[PDB]
């Protein structure tokens, strides 16, 4: 049974250091490179670097200056060390096992980095759900967009068609925009609130987001995309 098992610390502050040691087992690290992969949340897998069997070490040229990966087969652990970490280091790290030199083969458990000073952030972060829709002519939908800070009414929803410009669905977090179906609606207050769409029509086939307008910077949400079978 191939074993790979991360230990990393969970939490760190701005500007300092991160040291993650991966514990393998079933495997020779003289035969076999070991990988760091890191995800964030809601983003794509992203490739930090390898040391292969023989100790040839590649980064990615994306952190090249501020990563370090060694090793010490008699313990079979391998070491990885990222510089001058931020907030967009925020993700969830893994150890990767190949064959050899060719397919990034298994997997370890990962552990999850947080990176924030204490403040929990600064900047208001809009989470949107549900990311993926497929919907059925005539049914009726909900998107929610909540807001890690009350920022009152001030949310906008906006559509936005395949190839075209946004347009504003919703204002002021209820109030349906100029020129609006009243199938649109919009609720909430505070932190949660609800775009619903009645009697789903084609032309609704479209990208929905939400956008915060209490402090700056405004924020949008990550979006949400409707599907029609």
């Known amino acids: 049974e191939v074993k790979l098992l991360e230990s990393g610390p969970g939490l760190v502050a701005p500007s300092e250091s991160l040291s993650i040691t991966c514990t393998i087992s079933?495997?020779?690290?003289?035969?076999?490179?070991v990988s760091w992969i890191r995800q964030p949340p809601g983003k794509g897998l992203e490739w930090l670097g390898v040391?292969?069997?023989?100790?040839?070490?590649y980064f990615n040229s994306l952190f090249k200056s501020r990563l370090s990966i060694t090793r010490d087969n008699s313990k079979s652990q391998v070491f990885l060390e990222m510089d001058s970490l931020q907030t967009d280091d925020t993700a969830m790290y893994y150890c990767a096992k190949h064959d050899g030199h060719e397919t990034m083969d298994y997997w370890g458990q990962g552990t999850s980095v947080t990176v924030s000073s204490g403040g929990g952030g600064s900047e208001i972060v809009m989470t949107q759900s549900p990311k993926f829709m497929s919907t059925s002519i005539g049914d009726r939908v909900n998107i929610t967009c909540k807001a890690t800070q009350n920022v009152r009414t001030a949310v906008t929803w906006y559509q936005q068609k395949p190839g075209q410009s946004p347009q504003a669905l919703i204002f002021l977090a209820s109030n349906r925009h100029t020129g609006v179906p009243a199938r649109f609606t919009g609720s909430g207050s505070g932190t949660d609130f609800t775009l619903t769409i009645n009697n789903v029509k084609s032309e609704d086939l479209a990208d929905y987001f939400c956008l915060q307008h209490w402090n700056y910077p405004l924020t949008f949400g990550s979006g949400t995309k409707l599907e029609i079978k």
């Open positions: 040391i292969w069997g023989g100790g040839s070490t």
């Open positions: 079933g495997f020779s690290l003289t035969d076999d490179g």
